[PDB]
From a paper:
Human immunodeficiency virus type 1 (HIV-1) entry into target cells is mediated by its viral envelope (Env) glycoprotein, which is initially synthesized as a fusion-inactive precursor polypeptide (gp160) and then cleaved into the non-covalently surface subunit gp120 and transmembrane subunit gp41. The sequence structure of gp41 is defined with multiple functional domains, including the fusion peptide (FP), FP proximal polar region (FPPR), N-terminal heptad repeat (NHR), loop region, C-terminal heptad repeat (CHR), membrane proximal external region (MPER), transmembrane domain (TM), and cytoplasmic tail (CT). Firstly, the FP of gp41 is inserted into the cell membrane, leading an extended prehairpin state that transiently bridges the cell and viral membranes; then, three CHR helices fold in an antiparallel orientation into the trimeric NHR coiled coil grooves, resulting in a six-helix bundle (6-HB) structure that pulls the two membranes in apposition for fusion. Two hydrophobic pockets in the C-terminal portion of the NHR helices play important roles for the stability of 6-HB, thus being considered ideal target sites for anti-HIV agents.
Apart from the primary NHR mutations, some substitutions on the CHR helices also contributed to the T20 resistance as secondary or compensatory mutations, and in particular, a substitution of the polar residue asparagine to a positively charged residue lysine on position 126 (N126K) was frequently identified during the in vitro resistance selection and the treatment of HIV-1 infected individuals. In order to reveal the structural basis underlying the N126K phenotype, we determined the crystal structure of the C34N126K and N36 peptide complex. Two peptides form a canonical 6-HB structure, in which three C34N126K peptides (CHR) bind to the central trimeric N36 coiled coil (NHR) in an antiparallel orientation. All residues of C34N126K stands out clearly in a final electron density map, indicating 6-HB containing C34N126K is highly stable. The crystal belonged to the space group of C121, contained a complete 6-HB per asymmetry unit, and diffracted the x-ray to the resolution limit of 1.65 Å. Two structures are well aligned, which is indicated by nearly identical conformations adopted by PBD residues W117, W120 and I124 from C34 and C34N126K. In sharp contrast, our structure demonstrates that when N126 was replaced with a positively charged lysine, residue K126 attracted the negatively charged side chain of E123 and tilted its side chain away from the hydrophobic pocket, hence the interaction between PBD and the hydrophobic pocket could be further stabilized. Subsequently, we found that H53 side chain shifted to a conformation parallelly to the side chain of Y127, indicating the π-stacking between H53 and Y127 restored. In addition, the distance between carboxylate side chain of E123 and Nζ atom of K126 is 2.9Å, indicating a tight hydrogen bond interaction.
Author numbering:
A (entry chain A), E (entry chain D), F (entry chain C): 628 to 661
B (entry chain B), C (entry chain N), D (entry chain E): 546 to 581
The structure:
């Protein structure tokens, strides 16, 4: 369970960052359509 | 270029989510064995 | 074409992941019924 | 335009799935706290 | 747990809807390519 | 729970395959950008 906890936190933080980066790229791609 | 990069981003997100899912599966199995 | 094909792949992955999620929800509900 | 719209769709789905995941993690933690 | 139940329901419906919209867009994109 | 196990196994395998397919396609697409 202690390792589980560690891993949960790690991947949760990674996903948050990936989502953030994807959001930024999405708005850049939408801008570029113009 | 931007589109392909976004695809990589999305795929990476899916992979990380899969890791998290496998973790939840592990947790449920542990709980299930402890009670049942 | 490659991009569109990749979109299909990702959508399919998301769908499969949704099935998995639904499965974990079921499990959690089962455990909660017995545990609480 | 269609490809970009489809990237938005997929991203939104991943985000919704992330909420679901976080909810499963919460539930597992509640159950773990009681069994151990 | 009551709020949990509520949120599960909410997000599950949302995902179903997004999946549906995505499937529709996928077919439109495929037709456009043809 | 036996059916649960079966389904988990099924979807896990499927996602793995889809992820691999997507990785291959990603490589191909990057290559074509050149």
């Amino acid at each position: 369970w202690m390792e589980w906890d560690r891993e949960i936190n790690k991947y949760t933080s990674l996903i948050h960052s990936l989502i953030e980066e994807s959001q930024n790229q999405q708005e850049k791609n939408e801008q570029e359509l113009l | 270029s931007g589109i392909v990069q976004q695809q990589n981003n999305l795929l990476r997100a899916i992979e990380a989510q899969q890791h998290l899912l496998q973790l939840t599966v592990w947790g449920i199995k542990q709980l299930q064995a402890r009670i049942l």
